[PDB]
Coordinates of all heavy atoms in Angstrom, one line a residue:
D278 N 0.8 -1.2 0.0 CA 0.0 0.0 0.0 C 0.9 1.2 0.0 O 2.0 1.3 0.6 CB -0.9 0.0 1.2 CG -1.9 -1.2 1.2 OD1 -2.2 -1.6 0.2 OD2 -2.3 -1.6 2.4
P279 N 0.4 2.3 -0.6 CA 1.2 3.6 -0.6 C 1.2 4.3 0.7 O 2.2 4.8 1.2 CB 0.7 4.4 -1.7 CG -0.7 3.9 -1.9 CD -0.7 2.5 -1.6
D280 N 0.0 4.3 1.4 CA -0.1 5.1 2.6 C 0.4 4.5 3.8 O 1.1 5.2 4.6 CB -1.6 5.4 2.8 CG -2.5 4.2 2.7 OD1 -1.9 3.1 2.5 OD2 -3.7 4.3 2.9
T281 N 0.3 3.1 4.0 CA 0.8 2.5 5.2 C 2.4 2.4 5.0 O 3.1 2.6 6.1 CB 0.3 1.1 5.3 OG1 0.7 0.3 4.2 CG2 -1.3 1.1 5.3
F282 N 2.9 2.2 3.9 CA 4.3 2.3 3.7 C 4.8 3.8 3.9 O 5.9 4.0 4.4 CB 4.7 1.7 2.3 CG 6.1 2.0 1.8 CD1 7.2 1.6 2.6 CD2 6.3 2.8 0.6 CE1 8.5 1.8 2.1 CE2 7.5 3.0 0.2 CZ 8.6 2.5 0.9
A283 N 4.0 4.7 3.5 CA 4.4 6.2 3.7 C 4.4 6.5 5.2 O 5.2 7.3 5.7 CB 3.4 7.1 3.0
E284 N 3.6 5.8 6.0 CA 3.7 5.9 7.5 C 4.9 5.2 8.1 O 5.6 5.7 9.0 CB 2.4 5.4 8.1 CG 1.2 6.3 7.8 CD 0.0 5.8 8.6 OE1 0.0 4.7 9.2 OE2 -1.1 6.5 8.5
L285 N 5.1 4.0 7.5 CA 6.3 3.2 8.0 C 7.6 3.8 7.7 O 8.6 3.6 8.4 CB 6.2 1.8 7.5 CG 5.1 0.9 8.1 CD1 5.0 -0.4 7.3 CD2 5.3 0.7 9.5
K286 N 7.7 4.6 6.6 CA 8.8 5.5 6.3 C 9.1 6.4 7.5 O 10.3 6.5 8.0 CB 8.6 6.4 5.1 CG 8.6 5.7 3.7 CD 8.3 6.7 2.7 CE 8.3 6.2 1.3 NZ 8.0 7.3 0.3
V287 N 8.1 7.1 8.0 CA 8.3 8.0 9.1 C 8.6 7.3 10.4 O 9.4 7.8 11.2 CB 7.0 8.9 9.2 CG1 7.3 10.1 10.2 CG2 6.6 9.5 7.9
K288 N 8.0 6.1 10.5 CA 8.4 5.3 11.7 C 9.8 4.9 11.7 O 10.5 5.0 12.8 CB 7.5 4.0 11.8 CG 6.0 4.3 12.2 CD 5.3 3.0 12.4 CE 3.9 3.3 12.7 NZ 3.1 2.1 13.0
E289 N 10.3 4.5 10.6 CA 11.8 4.1 10.4 C 12.7 5.3 10.7 O 13.7 5.2 11.4 CB 12.0 3.5 9.1 CG 13.4 3.0 8.9 CD 13.7 2.4 7.5 OE1 12.8 2.4 6.7 OE2 14.8 2.0 7.2
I290 N 12.3 6.4 10.2 CA 13.2 7.6 10.4 C 13.1 8.1 11.8 O 14.2 8.5 12.4 CB 12.8 8.8 9.4 CG1 13.1 8.3 8.0 CG2 13.6 10.0 9.6 CD1 12.6 9.3 7.0
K291 N 12.0 8.0 12.5 CA 11.9 8.5 13.9 C 12.7 7.6 14.8 O 13.5 8.0 15.7 CB 10.4 8.5 14.3 CG 9.7 9.7 13.7 CD 9.9 11.0 14.4 CE 9.0 11.0 15.6 NZ 7.6 11.0 15.3
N292 N 12.5 6.3 14.6 CA 13.4 5.3 15.3 C 14.8 5.4 15.0 O 15.7 5.3 15.8 CB 12.9 3.9 15.0 CG 11.7 3.4 15.7 OD1 11.6 3.8 16.9 ND2 10.8 2.9 15.1
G293 N 15.1 5.9 13.8 CA 16.6 6.1 13.3 C 17.2 7.3 14.0 O 18.3 7.2 14.5
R294 N 16.5 8.4 14.1 CA 17.0 9.6 14.8 C 17.2 9.3 16.2 O 18.2 9.7 16.9 CB 16.0 10.8 14.6 CG 15.8 11.1 13.1 CD 14.9 12.4 13.1 NE 14.2 12.6 11.8 CZ 14.8 13.1 10.7 NH1 16.1 13.4 10.7 NH2 14.0 13.3 9.6
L295 N 16.2 8.6 16.9 CA 16.4 8.3 18.2 C 17.6 7.3 18.5 O 18.3 7.4 19.5 CB 15.1 7.6 18.7 CG 14.8 7.3 20.2 CD1 13.3 7.3 20.4 CD2 15.3 6.0 20.7
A296 N 17.8 6.3 17.6 CA 18.9 5.4 17.7 C 20.2 6.2 17.6 O 21.2 5.8 18.3 CB 18.8 4.3 16.7
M297 N 20.3 7.1 16.7 CA 21.6 7.9 16.5 C 21.9 8.8 17.8 O 23.0 8.7 18.2 CB 21.5 8.8 15.3 CG 21.4 8.2 14.0 SD 21.4 9.7 12.9 CE 20.9 9.0 11.4
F298 N 20.8 9.4 18.3 CA 21.0 10.2 19.5 C 21.4 9.4 20.7 O 22.3 9.7 21.5 CB 19.8 11.0 19.8 CG 20.0 12.1 20.7 CD1 20.5 13.3 20.3 CD2 19.5 12.0 22.0 CE1 20.7 14.4 21.2 CE2 19.7 13.0 23.0 CZ 20.3 14.3 22.5
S299 N 20.8 8.1 20.7 CA 21.2 7.2 21.9 C 22.6 6.7 21.7 O 23.3 6.6 22.7 CB 20.2 6.1 21.9 OG 20.4 5.3 20.7
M300 N 23.0 6.4 20.5 CA 24.4 5.9 20.3 C 25.4 7.0 20.6 O 26.5 6.7 21.1 CB 24.6 5.4 18.9 CG 24.0 4.1 18.6 SD 24.7 2.8 19.8 CE 26.4 2.8 19.3
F301 N 25.1 8.3 20.3 CA 25.9 9.4 20.7 C 26.0 9.4 22.3 O 27.1 9.7 22.9 CB 25.4 10.7 20.2 CG 26.3 11.9 20.5 CD1 27.5 12.1 19.7 CD2 25.9 12.8 21.4 CE1 28.3 13.2 20.0 CE2 26.8 13.8 21.7 CZ 28.0 14.1 20.9
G302 N 24.9 9.2 22.9 CA 24.9 9.1 24.4 C 25.8 7.9 24.9 O 26.5 8.1 25.8
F303 N 25.7 6.8 24.2 CA 26.6 5.6 24.6 C 28.0 6.0 24.5 O 28.8 5.7 25.4 CB 26.3 4.4 23.7 CG 25.1 3.6 24.0 CD1 24.0 3.7 23.1 CD2 25.1 2.8 25.1 CE1 22.9 3.0 23.4 CE2 23.9 2.0 25.3 CZ 22.8 2.1 24.5
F304 N 28.4 6.8 23.4 CA 29.8 7.1 23.2 C 30.3 8.1 24.3 O 31.4 8.0 24.7 CB 30.0 7.6 21.8 CG 29.9 6.6 20.7 CD1 29.7 7.0 19.4 CD2 29.9 5.2 21.0 CE1 29.6 6.1 18.4 CE2 29.8 4.3 20.0 CZ 29.6 4.7 18.7
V305 N 29.5 9.1 24.5 CA 29.9 10.1 25.6 C 29.9 9.5 26.9 O 30.9 9.8 27.7 CB 29.0 11.3 25.5 CG1 29.3 12.4 26.5 CG2 29.1 12.0 24.1
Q306 N 29.0 8.6 27.3 CA 29.1 7.9 28.6 C 30.3 7.0 28.6 O 30.9 6.8 29.7 CB 27.8 7.0 28.8 CG 26.5 7.8 29.1 CD 25.4 6.8 29.3 OE1 25.6 5.6 29.1 NE2 24.2 7.3 29.5
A307 N 30.6 6.4 27.5 CA 31.8 5.5 27.4 C 33.1 6.3 27.6 O 34.0 5.8 28.2 CB 31.8 4.8 26.1
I308 N 33.1 7.6 27.1 CA 34.3 8.4 27.4 C 34.3 8.8 28.9 O 35.4 8.8 29.5 CB 34.2 9.6 26.5 CG1 34.5 9.2 25.0 CG2 35.3 10.6 26.9 CD1 34.3 10.3 24.0
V309 N 33.2 9.2 29.4 CA 33.2 9.9 30.7 C 33.3 8.8 31.9 O 34.4 8.7 32.6 CB 31.9 10.7 30.9 CG1 31.9 11.2 32.4 CG2 32.0 11.9 30.0
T310 N 32.4 7.9 32.0 CA 32.4 7.0 33.2 C 33.2 5.8 33.1 O 33.6 5.2 34.1 CB 31.0 6.7 33.6 OG1 31.0 6.1 34.9 CG2 30.3 5.8 32.6
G311 N 33.5 5.4 31.9 CA 34.2 4.1 31.7 C 33.6 2.8 32.1 O 34.2 1.8 32.4
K312 N 32.2 2.9 32.3 CA 31.5 1.7 32.7 C 30.4 1.4 31.7 O 30.3 2.1 30.7 CB 30.7 2.0 34.0 CG 31.7 2.2 35.2 CD 30.8 2.4 36.5 CE 31.8 2.6 37.7 NZ 31.0 2.9 39.0
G313 N 29.9 0.2 31.8 CA 28.8 -0.2 30.9 C 27.6 0.6 31.1 O 27.3 1.2 32.1

């Protein structure tokens, strides 16, 4: 379908931006605290 796939596009991008911001958080925590 065009419309449901058009919504799943936005779902993939929203989860993507969240995952990038979280991985930047992982990297900065990894630099600072040195713990898991």
